[PDB]
């Protein structure tokens, strides 16, 4: 009599295979608005 080969994979090893890791290196670069020049005078200095 012959001997059939064994085809068998358990479900944990079929669908929990080591997956490729996601590719994450994305910083959120934020600018800074430049500070406006200070246009403001005192009234005492403005007329006196």
């Amino acid at each position: 009599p012959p001997t059939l080969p064994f085809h068998g994979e358990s479900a944990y090893r079929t669908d929990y295979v080591p997956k490729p890791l996601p590719e994450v290196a994305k910083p959120v670069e934020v600018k800074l608005p430049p500070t406006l020049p200070f246009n403001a005078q005192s009234c005492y200095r403005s007329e006196y």
């Binding site: 500070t35 200070f38 403001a40 005192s42 009234c43």
Partner: protein, 426 residues
């Protein structure tokens, strides 16, 4: 001279005060580093009202940031203009007061608050006088209102003459998250009325109404909302900070707005405000400023003043301007609009003039107003409170740590008689 100690409580208070220290620093010419970057004595001479000095410059804010969850203060630190605060001016806290007034006021807050008044005390008698305390916090939240309003009573009993000026975000009922907003707000207003001097009701919902209708912001984020409030927060402390023809401190505001001992819930509106492409079209004269700050769309509190009167109002102007163009506008709103202004008080408005405008804008207005229309949400949060409290809503997480049921009925009773006190003058 004069000194302000700024304490921020909770996630809302820390994120709304961080933008405040961004807009004050822009006004005083201070980098995220903390060095001056201009040539202006006026921009630097009244700096002790919000900044201390440490050896080689390094103008550190007088900020007492404090929270029971280490999630939002670190976000302030990592952001720009966030290294200005001292590492020991950060009262941390593990676990957390998860949306419970009691977890900030009876347990989990009483242990931390000993260290909080230490940091307050070093930044209180570190100078010569003290005008008062600026306290940004949140009524609609646990760690914000719990140790927030507790601190209000602690620094009142330690300094019972300083101005207790508090910016609070009241929970507006219509479109807002977290379900325990009625229980936090009603319990916190009770502590807020005999312990605070100038409570400024600044709702998130009405700030959204400013963003959608006035500014027409397509996607108003939470930084957009805090930018508006930080602008009003700079406009009220202007005369402690900059010269002017007619000056007005915070103690000016409390005397000339509060007729009777409680009566201290004001409405703010700040207005060089303009649409998206409307900077090329708006004028910036006083009459359009006055016509804008009295518009009900320009309230930070959705407590519509046409559904009420103006008990006493105030407008602290800023920028270069003439005194009569202030005066005739402050008189024309009284003569033309007479129904929404109370009669037993004459001349129901003060005005002040800062000669230093905000950065870029030639002229600006802030409008703090003691109006007898704030009781609309003193009824709104009370109806939300009693609808829950009748058939025994979320209370086992408010009882097992120490409060009894009588504190809830007394908190609603003080809410109710303050509603009746505002309805007295109507």
């Amino acid at each position: 001279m004069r000194e302000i100690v700024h304490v921020q409580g909770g996630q809302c208070g820390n994120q709304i005060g961080a933008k405040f220290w961004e807009v004050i620093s822009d006004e005083h010419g201070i980098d995220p580093t903390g060095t001056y970057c201009g040539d202006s004595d006026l921009q630097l001479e009244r700096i002790n009202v919000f900044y201390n000095e440490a050896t080689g410059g390094r103008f550190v804010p007088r900020a007492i940031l404090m929270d029971l969850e280490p999630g939002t203060m670190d976000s302030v630190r990592a952001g720009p203009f966030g290294q200005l605060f001292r590492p020991d001016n950060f009262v941390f806290g593990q676990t957390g007061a998860g949306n419970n007034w009691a977890k900030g006021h009876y347990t989990e807050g009483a242990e931390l608050i000993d260290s909080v008044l230490d940091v307050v005390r070093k930044e209180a008698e570190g100078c010569d006088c003290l005008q008062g305390f600026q306290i940004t916090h949140s009524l609609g939240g646990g760690t914000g209102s719990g140790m927030g309003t507790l601190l209000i009573s602690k620094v009142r009993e330690e300094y019972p003459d300083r101005i207790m000026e508090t910016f609070s975000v009241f929970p507006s009922p219509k479109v807002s998250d977290t379900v325990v907003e009625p229980y936090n707000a009603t319990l916190s207003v009770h502590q807020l009325v005999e312990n605070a001097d100038e409570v400024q009701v600044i709702d998130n919902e009405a700030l959204y109404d400013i963003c959608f209708r006035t500014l027409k912001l397509t996607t108003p984020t939470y930084g957009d909302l805090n930018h508006l409030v930080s602008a009003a927060m700079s406009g009220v402390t202007c005369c402690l900070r900059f010269p002017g023809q007619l000056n007005s401190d915070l103690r000016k505001l409390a005397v000339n707005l509060i007729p009777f001992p409680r009566l201290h819930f004001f409405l703010i509106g700040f207005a060089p405000l303009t649409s998206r492409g409307s900077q090329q079209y708006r004028a910036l004269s006083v009459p359009e400023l006055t016509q804008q700050m009295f518009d009900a769309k320009n309230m930070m509190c959705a407590s519509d003043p046409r559904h009420g009167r103006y008990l006493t109002a105030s407008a602290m102007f800023r920028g270069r301007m003439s005194t009569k163009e202030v005066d005739e506008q402050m008189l024309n709103v009284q003569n033309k609009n007479s129904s929404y202004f109370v009669e037993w008080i004459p001349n129901n408005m003060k005005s002040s003039v800062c000669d230093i405008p905000p950065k870029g804008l030639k002229m600006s207005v802030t409008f703090v107003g003691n109006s007898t229309a704030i009781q609309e949400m003193f009824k709104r949060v009370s109806d939300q409170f009693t609808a829950m409290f009748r058939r025994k809503a979320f209370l086992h997480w408010y009882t097992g740590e120490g409060m009894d049921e009588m504190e809830f009925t007394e908190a609603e009773s003080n809410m109710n008689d303050l509603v009746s006190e505002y309805q007295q003058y109507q």
